[PDB]
Amino acid sequence: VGEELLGRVVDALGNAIDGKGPIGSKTRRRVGLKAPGIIPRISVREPMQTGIKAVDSLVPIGRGQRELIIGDRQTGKTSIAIDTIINQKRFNDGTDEKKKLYCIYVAIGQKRSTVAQLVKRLTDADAMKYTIVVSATASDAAPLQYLAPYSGCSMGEYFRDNGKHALIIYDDLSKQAVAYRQMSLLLRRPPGREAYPGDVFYLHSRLLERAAKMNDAFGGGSLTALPVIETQAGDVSAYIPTNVISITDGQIFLETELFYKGIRPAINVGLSVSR
Amino acid sequence: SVDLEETGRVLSIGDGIARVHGLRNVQAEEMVEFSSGLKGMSLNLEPDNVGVVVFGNDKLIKEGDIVKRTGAIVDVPVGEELLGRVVDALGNAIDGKGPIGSKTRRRVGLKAPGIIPRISVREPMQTGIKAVDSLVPIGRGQRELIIGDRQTGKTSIAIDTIINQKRFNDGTDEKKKLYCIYVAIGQKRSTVAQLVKRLTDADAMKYTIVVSATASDAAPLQYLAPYSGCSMGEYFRDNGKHALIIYDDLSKQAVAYRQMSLLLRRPPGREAYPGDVFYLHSRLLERAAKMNDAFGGGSLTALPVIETQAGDVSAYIPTNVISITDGQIFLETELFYKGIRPAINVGLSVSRVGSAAQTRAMKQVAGTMKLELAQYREVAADAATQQLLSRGVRLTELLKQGQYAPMAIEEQVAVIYAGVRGYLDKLEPSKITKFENAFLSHVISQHQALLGKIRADGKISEETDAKLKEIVTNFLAGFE
Amino acid sequence: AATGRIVAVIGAVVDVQFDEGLPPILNALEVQGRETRLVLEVAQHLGESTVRTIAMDGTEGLVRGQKVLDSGAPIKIPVGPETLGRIMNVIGEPIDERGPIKTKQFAAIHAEAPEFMEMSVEQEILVTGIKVVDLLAPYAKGGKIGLFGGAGVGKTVLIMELINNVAKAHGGYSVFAGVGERTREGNDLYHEMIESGVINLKDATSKVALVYGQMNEPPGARARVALTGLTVAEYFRDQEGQDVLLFIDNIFRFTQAGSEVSALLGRIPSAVGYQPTLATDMGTMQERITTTKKGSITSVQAIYVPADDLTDPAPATTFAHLDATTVLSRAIAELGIYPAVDPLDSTSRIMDPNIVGSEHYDVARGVQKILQDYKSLQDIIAILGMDELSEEDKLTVSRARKIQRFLSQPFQVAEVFTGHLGKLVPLKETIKGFQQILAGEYDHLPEQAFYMVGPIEEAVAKADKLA
Amino acid sequence: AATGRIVAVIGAVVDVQFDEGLPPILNALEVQGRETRLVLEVAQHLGESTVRTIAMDGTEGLVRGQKVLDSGAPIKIPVGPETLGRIMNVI
Ligand SMILES: Nc1ncnc2c1ncn2[C@@H]1O[C@H](COP(=O)(O)OP(=O)(O)OP(=O)(O)O)[C@@H](O)[C@H]1O
Ligand SMILES: Nc1ncnc2c1ncn2[C@@H]1O[C@H](COP(=O)(O)OP(=O)(O)OP(=O)(O)O)[C@@H](O)[C@H]1O
Ligand SMILES: Nc1ncnc2c1ncn2[C@@H]1O[C@H](COP(=O)(O)OP(=O)(O)O)[C@@H](O)[C@H]1O
Ligand SMILES: [Mg+2]
Ligand SMILES: [Mg+2]
Ligand SMILES: [Mg+2]
């Protein structure tokens, strides 16, 4: 952990795969830790700007919050996060440090060429100087895809405890549960519903609780989260999506019928909420 | 004082599977014989015991019985002495006429030929039904499926097909004769008995073989039956002869195999079927082919039959089978109820290879009928539209046949020619049948020479066309 | 190297016990005392000096106690420039009765995917001559393409049309791999490739290689053919600088064949009877078919959907490995529209204004919006009828019904059983023809004139004849 | 007619062990020491001279060790012209 990882592409265990060289770091941190309790927290009071007109005006997002992006395939989920990452340049190229934000991107289950195109898109807009990319592609072993999100949350927590603000994105949380199910079945543990393990809820509940807003006695840092979920044929009442709907503070819905009627981005304003 | 290299003792019997202690030199898939006369098949070779599948009832096997080896993989009697005999799934006669004098045996499970030994389908396979021989032709070496619900007329097509071949089989040319094989799975015995009586009456049991595994029989016997018939059919294919095989119902075989699988405690899947159902039919229907000249020139044709529930063609087994065969024939129930018999849906039925193997005359008279029927279908939902409907109704009336009465190709050609030329656009739609019957009778009893000419030449010459026009107009004028 | 003894035979799974020299995983073994060569592959180390293997051929006639010999390396096949015009099988033996294949080097089936720093990110367009694909979801060069469809809807006719239109004019080589299909189709393909001139039997000017394992083979063989094709595809990319076209027929059989042996290996089934390791072993195979900084590979794959279901676990994990999708529907095929391509369910990665241009993008978005609007009126029309609509709704219904007809097209490979003539449209004519319909210039023509024609000029002439 | 002993009672399924001989499948057995008849029908041959049966009546008050008897044939019933106008149960 540290801030020498800015501008680098690393795997799930912190090894460079971009061909630059070794990473000079001085600190290490466990991947499984407990979230802050009740005393060290404070209310959410500051804005987090994205640059999307339909979001900043009807579904505002604060610093220290969790928000869900949910929809079918080929609807536009990735481009929202990509646009959100780019927008932060006008603040990081400034003077005061109370309005800067760092970004972390985590890719789980995707193929390598898509990540290469994403990194090229980022580097031609001068945005890699303040981003960290953690990747565990489809050719890696199941334990690495199972371990990837916590390894990125532990990197995000470094800024939170030193008076700085950070942002994290977990792409396709649906593809971590399949790796967990594969890993558990080969250990001869009994299955459950759809052969998922008996405690898939606890897999995500201990993960999404680590984003918080700290009070002045601890520094004043913050950490924000934006998970992603995919549904089959627009079925929001399935097993996995209902678990994660009841954990977050809000959700944004995307639909195909609005996509084909010229409404892009296809945000359904009649159902999207922000608590 | 017993050996354990070629002898065993039963340790447990139940759920079909019998576990035997001993037999240390047995081979995988080798026939073994019990002490009561029953026979089994070795399936699972394990470090301690062997699993055996019994081909019969399980009340005749007791713990402690002695099992002995035979020394061969499962095989069946094959030859030409089987013609005219009713046998079981293992080759034992059940007609009470004496033993079979076979001299050769062949394995039940053998791989199909490959890419090099094959060639394209060129020779025609005549049925006798006007709709099939005109709109969905079949060639020698092709797989065609007969799909439909219950009580629609699936078996009658096969029964009519078998009877027609007597014309060629009783002739002199040895390159136009076809042998036939019929396999019954999961039926009722009375139906088979009546079927064989029907076949006997028309002198068609002189070139036919029957294999039977009825409802009362055990599941493995209803699972082994088709391959046994396939091998007997394959005998002819490799000796420069032609054959035909008809599997009555593959769905009941699938049900029997599912029963067998579940008692072995294997993971179920969709509709509780095992995951190897596809391979079970993929092996069987790949053994019909058309050999090239260097390998002899034989053929083997197959016609599987499948039943659906409420016309659901998007199920597991029906979709599985469609991805194997080379075409399908659809039989509907509404047409059967309203009166159209045989009830074939022309819109859905298709043949991929039969089109190449078709007589020139039939092609000449069939193409126009196909186009006109398409137009009539499209307008069914001014003067020209009325003309289309008027032609369509009569064309539909023409394509109706009775039962147990195949026809020759030339008669079909003449009958279709009459309709396509528009000569029958004056008779009321209720009088088409009588005119067809009377015209056919007159032609058969009075000329016969133009029929011989059409048959020999294989094409409708201009002079023949003029003569046909003369005959038809004269008879129509005298119809009254 | 070392000898073992067979201890158990169940179906297509065999266990061997070694006194000394335990072989490593993925090595090949040879059986002693058989007429035809039989090869086994190591899969697991059980314990007490025992391994569990998978056979690549039939296992009838095996006896406990028989001898098994070790080789020392994975399966190796002949690879090089002398495989053009020949036919191989799973373990690289010629089945075209023309003698042995004399190449200089060999290669192993199992390898590893290219690393992250070898990827290329260039994008272009490929023109196919088919209106729906070019207008709505265009292809690209050096990308992955998939064709989804049920049973009897027409995937292989489209694959043969694409072969006829693209393969002939290509300057590089081509590879065709057939997995779990009909044999007679392979024979037809071989004979027609002999007739065309792609395969030449008297010289060295062939430009295609063929690998086959069909639906008459045991499941062990059908689980390994695609890698045999992949190896000969990769040799022409790495050692030589060439552009390669790879066609794979029904890659779905690669997944199904793997679940027929999962139960015998002693695993717990996950869902709908599939094996627990379904995504990882597909990701291992798919990541090798890519484009690197040494060459390019263009892939066209046919995929199967069981019981017309797109939510089945097998075809629902292949969407993430593609750059262009084409979905076929049975309902459209019922209405008589060929090819039966669904226009509201097909996507491509290069449909953006900065690659294809502004005009093309505007036309595509307009036609998709018009198609979407007409679908939302079906319930009212199906009961109340056409009379309840206002004038604008009737106009949109007429224009959408006119647009639906113009998307069909006659293929050249189907002329034999359709009685038509093949057509091939350039891109500009399609763009202009759809612009003209969107502008309302042809509102005075019957809707039956836009059926099974090529360029727009053929619609007015067919309408003129049909007065 | 050999004699066996009850070794397990689980609901309506009973297991019997025989010292010598073994009744074939689909045979009927008789249980001794009850106020009313109680027949059992053989279903499987587990092994170690033990069989698994099903019960044709209530199963309570049985003890692990009660003696059993083998009839030698499946269930037999009266058949003839004196069955007209009567009522009989399964056995
Ligand atoms: N605002 C927009 N305007 C135009 N095109 C857009 C817009 N947003 C998204 N798209 C297009 O939508 C398509 C899908 O976008 P995206 O890659 O974000 O989808 P996704 O939800 O991540 O899909 P997948 O499940 O494949 O990962 C792309 O072709 C993209 O260019
Ligand atoms: N062309 C025909 N003319 C008159 N009756 C016919 C005709 N074809 C079939 N039938 C009648 O239809 C009935 C069903 O015959 P068939 O056994 O062929 O049907 P099926 O659908 O195969 O039946 P099942 O499902 O019971 O096997 C019989 O009563 C038969 O006489
Ligand atoms: N472009 C087309 N024009 C006419 N008929 C077609 C076309 N495509 C498919 N068909 C119909 O589909 C059948 C072939 O289906 P096929 O391509 O084998 O399906 P699949 O690829 O799913 O096996 C043909 O008999 C033909 O009637
Ligand atoms: Mg995405
Ligand atoms: Mg029938
Ligand atoms: Mg196909």
XYZ file of N, CA and C in Angstrom, chain B residues 5 22-32 40-46 49-53 55 69-75 107-109, chain C residues 6-14 31 34 38 55 57-66:
174
model
N -10.934 -66.749 -12.120
C -10.555 -66.086 -13.357
C -11.631 -66.167 -14.428
N -15.406 -61.946 -8.459
C -14.612 -62.840 -9.283
C -14.394 -62.303 -10.683
N -14.415 -63.190 -11.679
C -14.271 -62.818 -13.085
C -13.089 -61.885 -13.309
N -11.876 -62.352 -13.035
C -10.708 -61.486 -13.069
C -10.091 -61.363 -14.455
N -10.632 -62.052 -15.460
C -10.152 -61.926 -16.834
C -11.233 -61.414 -17.781
N -12.331 -60.886 -17.244
C -13.413 -60.406 -18.085
C -12.974 -59.147 -18.826
N -13.629 -58.880 -19.956
C -13.371 -57.705 -20.772
C -14.525 -56.723 -20.655
N -14.213 -55.449 -20.900
C -15.242 -54.420 -20.905
C -16.235 -54.684 -22.027
N -17.526 -54.597 -21.699
C -18.611 -54.840 -22.651
C -18.543 -56.250 -23.237
N -18.514 -57.247 -22.356
C -18.479 -58.651 -22.748
C -19.721 -59.357 -22.225
N -20.337 -60.168 -23.080
C -21.529 -60.910 -22.689
C -21.192 -61.971 -21.648
N -22.016 -62.053 -20.601
C -21.876 -63.067 -19.566
C -23.221 -63.749 -19.378
N -26.245 -61.112 -19.541
C -25.978 -59.764 -19.081
C -24.793 -59.153 -19.804
N -24.501 -57.901 -19.459
C -23.426 -57.136 -20.073
C -22.577 -56.503 -18.984
N -21.260 -56.680 -19.072
C -20.357 -56.065 -18.106
C -20.218 -54.576 -18.383
N -20.426 -53.761 -17.349
C -20.378 -52.312 -17.523
C -19.249 -51.665 -16.729
N -19.212 -51.890 -15.420
C -18.244 -51.242 -14.542
C -17.242 -52.266 -14.024
N -15.981 -52.113 -14.416
C -14.898 -52.924 -13.879
C -14.246 -52.159 -12.735
N -14.406 -52.661 -11.519
C -13.897 -52.031 -10.315
C -12.860 -52.917 -9.641
N -15.095 -55.631 -7.484
C -16.195 -56.378 -8.086
C -16.481 -55.839 -9.482
N -17.478 -56.436 -10.136
C -17.891 -56.070 -11.485
C -19.387 -55.791 -11.485
N -19.793 -54.713 -12.155
C -21.204 -54.412 -12.329
C -21.740 -54.968 -13.634
N -22.892 -55.633 -13.558
C -23.501 -56.315 -14.698
C -24.931 -55.821 -14.875
N -25.342 -55.637 -16.128
C -26.693 -55.200 -16.476
C -27.472 -56.402 -16.993
N -30.382 -58.463 -18.791
C -31.337 -58.308 -19.884
C -32.575 -59.163 -19.642
N -18.175 -66.688 -18.127
C -17.815 -65.859 -19.266
C -18.200 -66.538 -20.573
N -18.327 -65.731 -21.625
C -18.571 -66.219 -22.977
C -17.413 -65.953 -23.924
N -16.752 -64.809 -23.798
C -15.573 -64.519 -24.571
C -15.778 -63.666 -25.800
N -16.816 -62.828 -25.832
C -17.087 -62.009 -27.005
C -17.869 -60.773 -26.600
N -17.663 -59.692 -27.354
C -18.467 -58.488 -27.188
C -19.858 -58.740 -27.756
N -20.845 -57.998 -27.242
C -22.239 -58.229 -27.605
C -22.399 -58.194 -29.116
N -23.001 -59.245 -29.665
C -23.198 -59.384 -31.098
C -24.520 -60.090 -31.356
N -21.203 -57.144 -34.430
C -21.327 -56.417 -33.173
C -22.467 -55.403 -33.231
N -23.066 -55.138 -32.068
C -24.138 -54.153 -31.999
C -23.585 -52.733 -32.054
N -22.460 -52.478 -31.386
C -21.894 -51.144 -31.354
C -20.656 -50.979 -32.210
N -3.448 -51.152 -15.460
C -4.818 -50.656 -15.423
C -5.543 -51.252 -14.224
N -6.219 -50.399 -13.456
C -6.871 -50.826 -12.233
C -8.391 -50.725 -12.312
N -8.935 -49.803 -13.106
C -10.380 -49.655 -13.191
C -10.747 -48.988 -14.504
N -11.830 -49.462 -15.119
C -12.346 -48.907 -16.366
C -13.834 -48.654 -16.188
N -14.242 -47.395 -16.322
C -15.648 -47.005 -16.250
C -15.909 -46.000 -17.360
N -16.605 -46.431 -18.407
C -16.960 -45.529 -19.481
C -15.765 -45.018 -20.254
N -15.450 -43.731 -20.093
C -14.308 -43.115 -20.758
C -13.236 -42.675 -19.770
N -13.231 -43.237 -18.565
C -12.282 -42.877 -17.519
C -11.539 -44.135 -17.091
N -10.209 -44.061 -17.070
C -9.352 -45.194 -16.739
C -8.342 -44.758 -15.687
N -1.219 -47.369 -24.758
C -1.699 -48.681 -24.339
C -1.023 -49.746 -25.191
N -2.841 -53.482 -28.776
C -4.047 -53.132 -29.512
C -3.714 -52.950 -30.984
N -4.116 -46.023 -29.202
C -5.018 -45.476 -28.197
C -4.198 -44.692 -27.184
N -9.606 -41.023 -21.899
C -9.285 -41.674 -23.160
C -9.707 -40.815 -24.344
N -10.365 -42.399 -27.391
C -10.956 -43.336 -28.336
C -11.783 -44.344 -27.550
N -12.392 -45.283 -28.270
C -13.230 -46.278 -27.623
C -12.430 -47.171 -26.694
N -13.075 -47.590 -25.605
C -12.392 -48.378 -24.578
C -13.038 -49.741 -24.374
N -13.378 -50.424 -25.462
C -13.975 -51.752 -25.385
C -12.892 -52.799 -25.599
N -12.853 -53.795 -24.720
C -11.855 -54.838 -24.787
C -10.708 -54.702 -23.807
N -10.738 -53.707 -22.924
C -9.662 -53.518 -21.964
C -9.852 -54.429 -20.760
N -8.741 -54.972 -20.259
C -8.748 -55.914 -19.147
C -7.875 -55.363 -18.032
N -8.332 -55.538 -16.794
C -7.535 -55.145 -15.636
C -6.228 -55.926 -15.605
N -5.127 -55.217 -15.390
C -3.806 -55.811 -15.412
C -3.001 -55.491 -16.650
N -3.614 -54.882 -17.662
C -2.925 -54.577 -18.904
C -1.874 -53.491 -18.681
